[PDB]
């Protein structure tokens, strides 16, 4: 298992514009297009992202290409973030995947807001961090995905995904 396969399980793949769990216009492998309510503002962003007139539909390749950029951006955002970097550096390879996952879903800013959990992860207090992470809108809104991520942090294995 690796970050790509992990995120592909959590986000799925859709080749036509869809709405995410929060109601936003998305496409491919969890690629957020816009927070705007307009399907037209969504199609525009999409065409801008792909470099062609897409009429709201893309190919598998196009999806995977967006996905590669997004994982890359996720990692680079963590490494450029003063709050995130130290956490990431302190973690083992599996747990690093767990943090990238959170970043991919919620953005650097949001994750960076989990101050207390971050401090617990850095200290390697797994059980305590898992408990703190669960007290969040995140866990309440997407409980199955949150539990999988949380279990990855607690355990340091890919069990939740196997
Ligand atoms: Cl983009
Ligand atoms: Cl969920």
UniProtKB/Swiss-Prot annotation:
Keywords for the protein's UniProt record, in alphabetical order: Antimicrobial, Bacteriolytic enzyme, Cytolysis, Glycosidase, Host cell lysis by virus, Host cytoplasm, Hydrolase, Viral release from host cell
Effect of residue 117 to V: 50-fold decrease in enzymatic activity
Reaction(s) this enzyme catalyzes, per UniProt: Hydrolysis of (1->4)-beta-linkages between N-acetylmuramic acid and N-acetyl-D-glucosamine residues in a peptidoglycan and between N-acetyl-D-glucosamine residues in chitodextrins
Gene Ontology CC: host cell cytoplasm
Entry annotated with the keyword Transferase: no
Induction (UniProt): Expressed late in the viral replication.
Domain of life: Viruses
pH note: Optimum pH is 7.3.
Compartments reported by the entry: Host cytoplasm
InterPro entries in the cross-refs: Endolysin_T4_type, Glyco_hydro_24, Lysozyme-like_dom_sf, Lysozyme_dom_sf, Phage_lysozyme-like, T4-type_lysozyme
Residues annotated as the enzyme's active site: 11 (proton donor/acceptor), 20 (proton donor/acceptor)
Signal sequence interval, chain numbering: none
Family: Belongs to the glycosyl hydrolase 24 family.
Function, as annotated: Endolysin with lysozyme activity that degrades host peptidoglycans and participates with the holin and spanin proteins in the sequential events which lead to the programmed host cell lysis releasing the mature viral particles. Once the holin has permeabilized the host cell membrane, the endolysin can reach the periplasm and break down the peptidoglycan layer.
PANTHER family per record: T4-TYPE LYSOZYME 1-RELATED (PTHR37406:SF1)
Protein name in the entry: Endolysin
Gene symbol of the encoding locus: E
């Amino acid at each position: 298992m690796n970050i790509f396969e992990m995120l592909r399980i959590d986000e799925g793949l859709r080749l036509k514009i869809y709405k995410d769990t929060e109601g936003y216009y998305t496409i491919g492998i969890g690629h957020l297009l816009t927070k705007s309510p307009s399907l037209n503002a969504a199609k525009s962003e999409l065409d801008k992202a792909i470099g062609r007139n897409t009429n709201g539909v893309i190919t598998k390749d196009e999806a995977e290409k967006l996905f590669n950029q997004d994982v890359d951006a996720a990692v680079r955002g963590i490494l450029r973030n003063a709050k995130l970097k130290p956490v990431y550096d302190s973690l083992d390879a599996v747990r690093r995947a767990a943090l990238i996952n959170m970043v991919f879903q919620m953005g650097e800013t949001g994750v960076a807001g989990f101050t207390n959990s971050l401090r617990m992860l850095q200290q390697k207090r797994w059980d305590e961090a898992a408990v703190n992470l669960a007290k969040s809108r995140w866990y309440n809104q997407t409980p199955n995905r949150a539990k999988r991520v949380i279990t990855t942090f607690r355990t340091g294995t890919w069990d939740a995904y196997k």
